[PDB]
Short mmCIF file of C-alpha atoms in Angstrom, two decimals:
data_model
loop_
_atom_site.label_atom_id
_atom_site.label_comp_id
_atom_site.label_asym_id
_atom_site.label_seq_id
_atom_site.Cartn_x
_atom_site.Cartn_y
_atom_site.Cartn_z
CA UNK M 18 -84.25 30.97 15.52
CA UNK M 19 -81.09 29.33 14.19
CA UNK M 20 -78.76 29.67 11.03
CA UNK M 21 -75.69 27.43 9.69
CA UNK M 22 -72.58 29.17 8.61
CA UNK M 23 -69.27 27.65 6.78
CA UNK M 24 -67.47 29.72 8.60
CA UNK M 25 -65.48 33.20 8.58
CA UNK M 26 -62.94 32.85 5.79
CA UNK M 27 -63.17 31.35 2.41
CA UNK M 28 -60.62 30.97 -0.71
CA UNK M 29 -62.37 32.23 -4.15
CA UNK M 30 -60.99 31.78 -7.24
CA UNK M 31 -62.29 33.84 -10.22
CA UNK M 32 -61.95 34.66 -14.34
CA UNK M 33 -59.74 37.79 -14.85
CA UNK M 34 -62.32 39.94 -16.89
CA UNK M 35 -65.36 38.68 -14.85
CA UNK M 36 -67.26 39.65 -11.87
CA UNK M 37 -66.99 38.09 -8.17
CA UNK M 38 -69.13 38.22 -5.20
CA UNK M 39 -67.04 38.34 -1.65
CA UNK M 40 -69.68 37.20 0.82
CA UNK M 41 -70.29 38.92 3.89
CA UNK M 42 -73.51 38.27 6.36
CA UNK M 43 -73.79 38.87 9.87
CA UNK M 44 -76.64 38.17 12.66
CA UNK M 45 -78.01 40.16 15.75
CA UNK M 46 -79.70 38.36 18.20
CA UNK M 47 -79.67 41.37 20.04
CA UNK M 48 -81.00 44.84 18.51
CA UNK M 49 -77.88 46.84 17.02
CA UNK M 50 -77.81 50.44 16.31
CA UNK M 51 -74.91 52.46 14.59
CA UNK M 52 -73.11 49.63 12.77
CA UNK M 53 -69.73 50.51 11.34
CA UNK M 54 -68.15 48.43 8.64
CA UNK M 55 -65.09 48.66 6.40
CA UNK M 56 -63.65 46.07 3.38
CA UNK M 57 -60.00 46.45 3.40
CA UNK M 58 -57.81 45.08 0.91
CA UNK M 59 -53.95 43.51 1.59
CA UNK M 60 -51.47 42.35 -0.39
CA UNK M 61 -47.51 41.84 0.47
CA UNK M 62 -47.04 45.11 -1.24
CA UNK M 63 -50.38 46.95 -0.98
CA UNK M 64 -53.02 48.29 1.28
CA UNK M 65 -56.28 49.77 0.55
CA UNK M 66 -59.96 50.76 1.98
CA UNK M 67 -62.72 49.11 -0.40
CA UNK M 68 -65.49 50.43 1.01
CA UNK M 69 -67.01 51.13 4.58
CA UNK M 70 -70.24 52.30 5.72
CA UNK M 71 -73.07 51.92 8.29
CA UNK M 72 -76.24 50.24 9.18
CA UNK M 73 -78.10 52.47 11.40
CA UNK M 74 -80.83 48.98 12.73
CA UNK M 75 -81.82 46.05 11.81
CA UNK M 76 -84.90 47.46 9.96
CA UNK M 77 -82.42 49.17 7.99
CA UNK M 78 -80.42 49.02 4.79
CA UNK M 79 -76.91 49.55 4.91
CA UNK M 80 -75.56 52.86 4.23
CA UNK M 81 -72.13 53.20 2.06
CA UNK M 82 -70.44 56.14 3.37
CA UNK M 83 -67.02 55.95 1.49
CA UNK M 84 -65.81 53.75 -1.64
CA UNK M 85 -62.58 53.67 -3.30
CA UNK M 86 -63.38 53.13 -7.13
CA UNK M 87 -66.51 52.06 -8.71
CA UNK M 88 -64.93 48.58 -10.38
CA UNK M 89 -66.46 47.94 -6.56
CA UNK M 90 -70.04 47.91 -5.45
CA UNK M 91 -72.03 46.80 -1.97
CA UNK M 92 -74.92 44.52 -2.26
CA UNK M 93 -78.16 41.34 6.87
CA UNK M 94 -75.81 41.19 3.70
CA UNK M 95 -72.99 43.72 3.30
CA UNK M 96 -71.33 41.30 0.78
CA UNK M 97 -69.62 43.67 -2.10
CA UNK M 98 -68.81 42.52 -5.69
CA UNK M 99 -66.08 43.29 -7.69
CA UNK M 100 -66.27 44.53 -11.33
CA UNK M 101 -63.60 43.46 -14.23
CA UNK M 102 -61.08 41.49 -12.66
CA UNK M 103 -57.70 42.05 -13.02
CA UNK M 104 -55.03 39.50 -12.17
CA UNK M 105 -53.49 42.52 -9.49
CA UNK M 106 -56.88 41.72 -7.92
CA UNK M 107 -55.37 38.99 -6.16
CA UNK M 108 -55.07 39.21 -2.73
CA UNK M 109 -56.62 38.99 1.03
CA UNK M 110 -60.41 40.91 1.22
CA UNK M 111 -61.42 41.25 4.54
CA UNK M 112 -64.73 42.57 5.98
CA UNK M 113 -64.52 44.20 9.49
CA UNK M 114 -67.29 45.00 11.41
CA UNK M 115 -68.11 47.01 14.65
CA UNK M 116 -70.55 46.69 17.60
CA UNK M 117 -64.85 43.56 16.97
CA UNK M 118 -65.44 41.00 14.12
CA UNK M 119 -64.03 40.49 10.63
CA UNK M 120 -64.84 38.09 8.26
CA UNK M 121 -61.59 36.72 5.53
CA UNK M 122 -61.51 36.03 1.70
CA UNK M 123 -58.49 34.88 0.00
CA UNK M 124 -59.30 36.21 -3.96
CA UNK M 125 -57.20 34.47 -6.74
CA UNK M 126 -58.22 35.93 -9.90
CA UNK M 127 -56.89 32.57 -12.42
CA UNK C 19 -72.76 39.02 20.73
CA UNK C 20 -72.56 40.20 16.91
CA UNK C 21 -71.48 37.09 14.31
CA UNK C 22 -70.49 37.66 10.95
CA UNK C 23 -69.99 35.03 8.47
CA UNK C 24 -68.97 34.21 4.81
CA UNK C 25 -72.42 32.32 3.98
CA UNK C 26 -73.64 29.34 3.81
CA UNK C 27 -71.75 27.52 0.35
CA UNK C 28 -67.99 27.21 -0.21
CA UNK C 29 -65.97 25.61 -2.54
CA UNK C 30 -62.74 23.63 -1.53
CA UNK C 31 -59.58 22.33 -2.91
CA UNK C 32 -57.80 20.01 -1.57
CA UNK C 33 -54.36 17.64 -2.56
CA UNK C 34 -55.01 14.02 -2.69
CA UNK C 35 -53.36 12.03 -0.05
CA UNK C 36 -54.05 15.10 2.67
CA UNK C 37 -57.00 15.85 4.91
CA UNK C 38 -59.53 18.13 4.82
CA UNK C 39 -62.13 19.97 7.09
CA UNK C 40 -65.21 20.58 5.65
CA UNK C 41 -66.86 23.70 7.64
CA UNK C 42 -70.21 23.84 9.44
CA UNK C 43 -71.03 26.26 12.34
CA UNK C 44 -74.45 26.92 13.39
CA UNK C 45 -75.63 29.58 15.91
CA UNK C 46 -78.57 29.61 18.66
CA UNK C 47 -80.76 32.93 19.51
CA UNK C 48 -83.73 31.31 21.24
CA UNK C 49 -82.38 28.40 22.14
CA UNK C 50 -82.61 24.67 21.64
CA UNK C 51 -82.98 21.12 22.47
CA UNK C 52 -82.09 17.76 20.37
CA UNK C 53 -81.14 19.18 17.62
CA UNK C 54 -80.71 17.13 14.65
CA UNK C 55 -77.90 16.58 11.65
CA UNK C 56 -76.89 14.85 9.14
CA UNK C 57 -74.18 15.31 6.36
CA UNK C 58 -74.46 13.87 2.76
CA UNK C 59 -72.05 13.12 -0.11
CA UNK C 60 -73.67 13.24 -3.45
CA UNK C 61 -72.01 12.90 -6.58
CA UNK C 62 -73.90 13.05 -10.32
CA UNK C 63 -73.73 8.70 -9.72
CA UNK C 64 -73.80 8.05 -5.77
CA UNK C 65 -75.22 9.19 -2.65
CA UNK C 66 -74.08 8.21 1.33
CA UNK C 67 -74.59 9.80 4.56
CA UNK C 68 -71.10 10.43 5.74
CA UNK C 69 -72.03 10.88 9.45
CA UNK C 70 -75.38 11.64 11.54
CA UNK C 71 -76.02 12.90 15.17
CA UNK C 72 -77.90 15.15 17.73
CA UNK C 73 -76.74 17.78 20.00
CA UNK C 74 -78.77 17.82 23.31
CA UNK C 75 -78.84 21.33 23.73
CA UNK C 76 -76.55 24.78 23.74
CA UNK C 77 -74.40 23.57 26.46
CA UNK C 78 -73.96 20.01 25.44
CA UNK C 79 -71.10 18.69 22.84
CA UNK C 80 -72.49 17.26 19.36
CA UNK C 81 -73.30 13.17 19.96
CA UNK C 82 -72.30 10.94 17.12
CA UNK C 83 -74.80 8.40 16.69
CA UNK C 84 -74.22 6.83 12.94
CA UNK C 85 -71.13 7.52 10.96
CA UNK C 86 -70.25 5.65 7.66
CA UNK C 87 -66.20 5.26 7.62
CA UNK C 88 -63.51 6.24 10.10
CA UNK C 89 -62.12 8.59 7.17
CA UNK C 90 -64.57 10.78 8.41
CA UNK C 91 -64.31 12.38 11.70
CA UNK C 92 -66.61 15.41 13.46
CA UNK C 93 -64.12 18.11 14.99
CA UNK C 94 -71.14 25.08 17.78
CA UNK C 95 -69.33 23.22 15.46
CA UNK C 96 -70.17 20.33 13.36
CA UNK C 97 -67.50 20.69 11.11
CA UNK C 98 -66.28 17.27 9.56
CA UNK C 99 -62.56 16.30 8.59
CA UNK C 100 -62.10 14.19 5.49
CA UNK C 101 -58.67 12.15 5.95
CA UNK C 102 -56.81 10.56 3.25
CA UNK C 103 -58.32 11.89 0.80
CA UNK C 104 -58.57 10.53 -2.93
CA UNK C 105 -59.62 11.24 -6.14
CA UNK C 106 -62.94 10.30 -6.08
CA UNK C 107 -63.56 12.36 -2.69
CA UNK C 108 -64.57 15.11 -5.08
CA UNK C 109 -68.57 16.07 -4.79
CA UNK C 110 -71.15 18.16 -2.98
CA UNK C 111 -71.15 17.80 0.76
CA UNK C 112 -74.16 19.12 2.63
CA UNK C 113 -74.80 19.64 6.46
CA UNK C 114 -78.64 19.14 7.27
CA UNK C 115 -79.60 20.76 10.65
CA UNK C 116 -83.11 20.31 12.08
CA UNK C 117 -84.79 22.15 14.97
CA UNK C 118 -88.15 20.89 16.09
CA UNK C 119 -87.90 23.52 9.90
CA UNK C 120 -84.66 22.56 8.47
CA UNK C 121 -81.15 24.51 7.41
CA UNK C 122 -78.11 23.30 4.83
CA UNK C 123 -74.48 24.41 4.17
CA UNK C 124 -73.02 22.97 1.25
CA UNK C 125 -69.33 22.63 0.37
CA UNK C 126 -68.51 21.54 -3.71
CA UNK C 127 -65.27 19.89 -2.68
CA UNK C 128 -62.55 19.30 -5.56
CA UNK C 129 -59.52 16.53 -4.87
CA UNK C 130 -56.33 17.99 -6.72
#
C-alpha cells in the first residue's frame, strides 16, 4: 500500500558504554530474490566491513553471512546494533544494498 | 525499484537563527489518489498544525491548502523547512499521511 520514510541518512548521537540501534529498512514492491547487503564503516583514517549478508525473498529472514566482531549484531529490517560504545566508534555507518542503494548514519558516540 | 530507508523517527539538531528541513518521504506500490497530510508541532504545553495539504495522485506535485506561518515552507516529498529558527522551535514534529488507514513520521527536533 504506502509507507512514510524520513529519509536515507540520519545523525545519531549515543552514551560511550551503551548500546545503539543504526536503522536500516527497505521495501519491494516487486518480488526480490538473492538480496546482498553489506554495513561498512568509514572514518578519515579507517575502513572496515561490519557485517553483510543476504535475504534470499521476501518470505524470508535475512541471512548474515560474514561479521567483523561480535560488539556488532543484525536485527524488511536489516538494521544492526552496536554493543559497548567506544568513543573510536565515531564515524560514518553506511548500509548498502543490492538488487544499487545505500542508506547513511553519521554515529557520534558523546 | 528497491528503496531503503533509515525509518520512520529522527532526531534533529539544529543552531538557532538557521533553517532546518524536517524530512518526510512517502512511497506508492498500488497507487493513489487525494492523498491526505498534515504536520503537527506539539510541545508538553502547545499544539498547532504547521501546514496541511493533498496530493492528487503519483504524478501530481503536493497542493498546499492551509499553512500556519510563512516560517514554514513544503520543499514524493513532503518534507518541510523550518526558517529562522528559535529557541522555542524545539518539540515533536509529526507528518500524518492518509490514503482512503493512516501513517506518521516523527522528528524530536532540538534548537541549539
Amino acid at each position: 500500500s504506502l509507507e512514510v520514510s524520513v529519509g536515507k541518512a540520519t545523525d545519531i548521537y549515543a552514551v560511550n558504554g551503551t548500546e545503539i540501534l543504526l536503522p536500516c529498512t527497505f521495501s519491494s514492491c516487486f518480488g526480490f530474490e538473492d538480496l546482498h547487503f553489506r554495513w561498512t564503516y568509514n572514518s578519515s583514517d579507517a575502513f572496515k566491513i561490519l557485517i553483510e549478508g543476504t535475504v534470499k525473498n521476501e518470505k524470508s529472514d535475512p541471512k548474515v553471512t560474514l561479521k567483523d566482531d561480535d560488539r556488532i549484531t543484525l536485527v524488511n529490517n536489516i538494521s544492526i546494533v552496536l554493543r559497548d560504545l567506544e568513543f573510536s566508534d565515531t564515524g560514518k555507518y553506511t548500509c548498502h544494498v543490492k538488487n544499487q542503494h545505500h542508506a547513511t548514519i553519521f554515529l557520534q558516540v558523546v
